[PDB]
Ligand binder design. Sequence first.
Ligand SMILES: CC(=O)O[C@H]1C(=O)[C@@]2(C)[C@H]([C@H](OC(=O)c3ccccc3)[C@]3(O)C[C@H](OC(=O)[C@H](O)[C@@H](NC(=O)c4ccccc4)c4ccccc4)C(C)=C1C3(C)C)[C@]1(OC(C)=O)CO[C@@H]1C[C@@H]2O
Ligand SMILES: Nc1nc2c(ncn2[C@@H]2O[C@H](COP(=O)(O)OP(=O)(O)OP(=O)(O)O)[C@@H](O)[C@H]2O)c(=O)[nH]1
Ligand SMILES: Nc1ncnc2c1ncn2[C@@H]1O[C@H](COP(=O)(O)OP(=O)(O)NP(=O)(O)O)[C@@H](O)[C@H]1O
Ligand SMILES: Nc1nc2c(ncn2[C@@H]2O[C@H](COP(=O)(O)OP(=O)(O)O)[C@@H](O)[C@H]2O)c(=O)[nH]1
Ligand SMILES: [Mg+2]
Lengths: 389, 451, 433
Amino acid sequence: MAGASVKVAVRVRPFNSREMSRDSKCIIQMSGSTTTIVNPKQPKETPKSFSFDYSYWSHTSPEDINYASQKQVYRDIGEEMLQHAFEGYNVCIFAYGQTGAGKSYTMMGKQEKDQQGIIPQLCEDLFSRINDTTNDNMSYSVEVSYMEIYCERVRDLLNPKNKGNLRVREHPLLGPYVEDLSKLAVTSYNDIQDLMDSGNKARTVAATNMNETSSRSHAVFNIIFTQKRHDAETNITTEKVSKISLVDLAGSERADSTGAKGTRLKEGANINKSLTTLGKVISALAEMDSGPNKNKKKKKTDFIPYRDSVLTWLLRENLGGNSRTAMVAALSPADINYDETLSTLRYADRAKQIRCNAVINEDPNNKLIRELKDEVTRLRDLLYAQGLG
Amino acid sequence: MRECISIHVGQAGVQIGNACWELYCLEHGIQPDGQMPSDKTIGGGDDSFNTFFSETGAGKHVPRAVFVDLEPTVIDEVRTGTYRQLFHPEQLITGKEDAANNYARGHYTIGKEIIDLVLDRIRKLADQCTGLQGFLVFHSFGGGTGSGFTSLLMERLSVDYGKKSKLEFSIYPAPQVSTAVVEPYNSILTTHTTLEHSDCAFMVDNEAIYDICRRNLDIERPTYTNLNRLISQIVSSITASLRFDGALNVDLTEFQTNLVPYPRIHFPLATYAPVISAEKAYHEQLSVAEITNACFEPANQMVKCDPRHGKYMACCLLYRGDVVPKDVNAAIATIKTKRSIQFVDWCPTGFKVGINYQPPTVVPGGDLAKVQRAVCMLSNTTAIAEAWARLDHKFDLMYAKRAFVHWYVGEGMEEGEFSEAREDMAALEKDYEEVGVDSVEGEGEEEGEEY
Amino acid sequence: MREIVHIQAGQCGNQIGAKFWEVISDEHGIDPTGSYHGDSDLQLERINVYYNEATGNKYVPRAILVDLEPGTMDSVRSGPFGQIFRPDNFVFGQSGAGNNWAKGHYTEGAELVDSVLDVVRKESESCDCLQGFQLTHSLGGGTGSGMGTLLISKIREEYPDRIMNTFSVMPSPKVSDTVVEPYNATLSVHQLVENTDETYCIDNEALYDICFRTLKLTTPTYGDLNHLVSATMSGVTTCLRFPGQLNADLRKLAVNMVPFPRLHFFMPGFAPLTSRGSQQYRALTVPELTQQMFDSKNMMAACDPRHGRYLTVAAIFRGRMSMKEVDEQMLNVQNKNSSYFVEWIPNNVKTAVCDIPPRGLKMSATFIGNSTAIQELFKRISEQFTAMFRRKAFLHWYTGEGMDEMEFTEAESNMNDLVSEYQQYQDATADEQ
Ligand SMILES: CC(=O)O[C@H]1C(=O)[C@@]2(C)[C@H]([C@H](OC(=O)c3ccccc3)[C@]3(O)C[C@H](OC(=O)[C@H](O)[C@@H](NC(=O)c4ccccc4)c4ccccc4)C(C)=C1C3(C)C)[C@]1(OC(C)=O)CO[C@@H]1C[C@@H]2O
Ligand SMILES: Nc1nc2c(ncn2[C@@H]2O[C@H](COP(=O)(O)OP(=O)(O)OP(=O)(O)O)[C@@H](O)[C@H]2O)c(=O)[nH]1
Ligand SMILES: Nc1ncnc2c1ncn2[C@@H]1O[C@H](COP(=O)(O)OP(=O)(O)NP(=O)(O)O)[C@@H](O)[C@H]1O
Ligand SMILES: Nc1nc2c(ncn2[C@@H]2O[C@H](COP(=O)(O)OP(=O)(O)O)[C@@H](O)[C@H]2O)c(=O)[nH]1
Ligand SMILES: [Mg+2]
């Protein structure tokens, strides 16, 4: 048992074909750990500002200077998370965003493999490290599961049966789980990605006023990783069991953006409730992580509202206890989608909420005038001193 | 034809409308069934004033009113009441549930499928009107309907009509007293619409009116009827300038030209001076000076805020009855010499005056005494900041733990419409703090050229 | 038009429902034969909340009676108001659950739930604008608990956006009538915590205390307890049926009373209550009603509020009264007892007023509290449950009906988590680290 510190990272995407075809203007600026945004409809008022753990400028893909390369973000998040998984403890990766921002790129990456996402690289490193340590005394096992949560009802994405609502149980020692959840073994990342495509074809997706293909239900691809050791003895014993969770979120929305009734309103409301509960639990976990980490005290165990949603309930083991987590959030550079980008920031700011301060860029003219006035004063005080004035 | 369309939203709006329309019917001699026997007894006249009532062929008079709510109960009380024949049968009442102290339920989910009918009937009323002056919207902060549906309706009206004035009378939450646990959320979420779209918003507090009733009228156990009657008197004093002749008449545009220095500070307080019981109506002169002084007493304010802690930015006095200009001039002159009343240094005039000949009426069964003179003061000041600040604190105490939030997000909103509103409140308070500061000393720093 | 479907399962639920329909029919002036003979014209204005109209200018309630034993149905029919109910809403079987939760939920109730759902759906489809459902049952029993939980689960599956109330009679430490109370109570709470919007906590111990010490009844019987309960249920939804100065729907109560989804267990109370001869000695005023409502002995849950903090409270007054008195009294109650109210809610007293009082009274009031102290109740059940589950006292009677040992553990863990959630907002500061 240990902390659950959360690493917050935000990346911007380049202009798509439609945006580059138009004369749309960029609106996101980044510097250090700060990201600032300007209203196109109120250019006179002020920019808004936010501060995250990592700001990534992937606006220009071929660029080298201050370019957020895929390998850089991997080394920042995925490599450390995979190492923590290999140590024998759980880890989880949250993908949050809205259609247009481009979350699925960073969540998967392109097929060319020169520009890869977190997941294919993680799978490659996982199986490379596994195959590079298969000595005589060590045995390794890996298996994968894939399931969705739609309107707080769990469904299986791989099994082709009727998409019924699976039952959620609580094993006394192993925690929450889902009954009749098909679990398959894998040996190469090609099989993992093929299963991913097969399951992604089965997702529940509906057309919105924002995009014609939007995720209407949360989805998780969970990797269970078991290590067995054979000491100088007749017994082969499982050392540790760790999990790598790859959670995909359905982004928030407003009824104004999609003013449709019936199923759409219910889906949006349930998604928003799930996001609110998830943010609350992650914020409480981060606060408890920060507190003891510096104080080393044990203020009981707090109360973490896991049960308020099935999403947080299933991910109880990965969220809490000893673990490490990191949420990646995608943005959109188009001015027209301002209401989306700022909204994502308000969700990305949650958990590890830190002071942002105001980004100040003084006028060069005023700076020059002030510097020259100070220089005149200094030189006059020097000359009057040596009785030369 | 100085026509004005009244809109009533929510239970508070409908009940204040009942009081207001009782007073209006009594003022012009209209019976509850819409007939006016005064013209028949006399022979003819202009007594069917087109400000509020529209005359049909058969001598009936239909009010220019629009009642809206989501509960059938509050307006079914009116459909089978004393005034059932006065109103048009169309009352725009959704036969469903209510916003349930939920801004999201009233703005996004259930506010739809009733807004279209309301806008259609408002258009039908506006088509009959020539030279429409503006709108008078009655609602209440802290309620689901009066917040969400009022926001939606104001947005649509600003989109459609645009240039017509839109005055607002709203019941603000009291500092201590309250009737709901989620009042602060609904109150804060309405700032965007009450700021961006309205032209002038008048706020009243139930605690202040209860104090006034207990102390002045000697009513130990008031109900909402007395409060609605007082608010009706206020609105009648505001609107009388365009119904009756007078020495100096103040239209609804002079209001906005004189009272709001900048677009974002249009939140004036209101007060009524000669609030006195019948027994205490004797032993008192009720001259212009007395009522004018009583308008400035902090005890008589209709919102729990002390003007002594702020600065007066603009004042508008509206007198009714046997009043003459020279008494008003003397009252203003003696007021300007008091050091307890401070005006901003950048408004040296600081007063707008209007006079009307028609004295105020007395409702049978009421509690206000018959008087010869009256005055209603509307005062744009900076003390109103306090009224926001307390409420702002309350909001924080609930939003730190995200209490009661799942109800709001389950209807269409996300958490950001819950922060954006808070930031807008903070910006408004900063503006009110900035405007009231005295001009910097010799505002051109200092000056003096050769000669 | 807000309309409520009433369901009553088990002996306790059926008896309370019969008394409740007696009370409501008296309030709306309905004859036992179903005709109307009232006097005030406002009684028919909102009669469609509970009653359907029938061709002979008759009125029939929307009650749906359920029981796995036909004796209680025979008792209900052979009663003062038996003829009022529709014959087709008497859904029942034979070979009752026999105090076995498994039989009520899995084996026996699973076959009758289809017929009950058919009747419920038939009543639902004829409703102009349905608001919610009501259920009356006993957690510590057999058919009532299991079938009520199963019906709640099915209905919430079918009607997710509708309100669901529950007037559940939970067991007591001292007054216990069945030996397998803890298992049934635990397994029932495990479902109620998830699939219910509002739950009202009732137990016979508090009602007996009220009868002994307030009404001064020498020999109270179940009729009087049902009378008090029925008074509460009629008080809760008064604003749907009669006009008011400040209305309060069921959804308004749910929004104002429930801060978080899992905290929806309420402590009910009613005022005034006087013992006949004492009636002339005490005046009826809003201060007296407020004093009696917040008194510790008036609660019908056997949980002392003084051992916790009120997360929220709601008051529904009936009668012609001044709003200033109500607001002043609630503010005074909040200010004086500052230590018994949670600090991080600025104002946690909802108030509603209705003009029309009960028939023979000038003023009345209903009180709905939500305080941390309710955890005590759950704790007591847990304190018994483990004491029987550790040794598997009567477990085989359950496992022979399809159930499993893991499910008991999930129920216990869920109740413990609920108790912890209530317990967190219960200490009167959090400063030290
Ligand atoms: C006539 C009069 O002034 O006498 C009262 C009376 O003496 C008292 C003691 C009544 C009386 O109640 C009881 O004795 C009683 C006994 C056991 C359990 C519950 C009540 C009364 O019986 C009860 C009766 O109440 C009503 O009629 C209400 O409308 C009540 N309905 C019924 O009791 C009822 C009974 C049979 C069939 C149908 C309805 C009600 C309460 C809440 C919501 C709706 C209706 C009243 C006025 C009285 C008597 C007759 C003595 C009380 O009744 C209530 C619950 O309001 C008990 O304490 C109150 C206060 C009253 O002072
Ligand atoms: N002065 C005055 N205030 C009132 C009156 N009626 C209600 N209010 C105020 O309104 C607040 C409650 O909100 P409401 O306006 O009643 O909400 P609503 O219009 O019924 O809309 P819903 O919440 O959906 O039912 C209370 O806090 C009161 O202070 C009234 O008759 N006179
Ligand atoms: N750093 C990046 N560099 C280049 N392209 C990017 C980058 N981030 C995102 N993208 C784009 O993201 C697109 C894929 O996502 P897109 O189709 O825009 O939304 P989506 O993924 O389908 N919905 P969502 O997953 O919620 O964001 C690709 O066409 C990429 O061009
Ligand atoms: N208030 C009240 N409670 C009752 C009544 N009958 C039984 N109970 C309670 O209900 C419990 C028994 O449950 P029971 O009604 O037999 O459940 P059922 O067999 O499913 O109908 C006991 O602990 C009693 O306290 C009644 O008439 N009134
Ligand atoms: Mg209402």
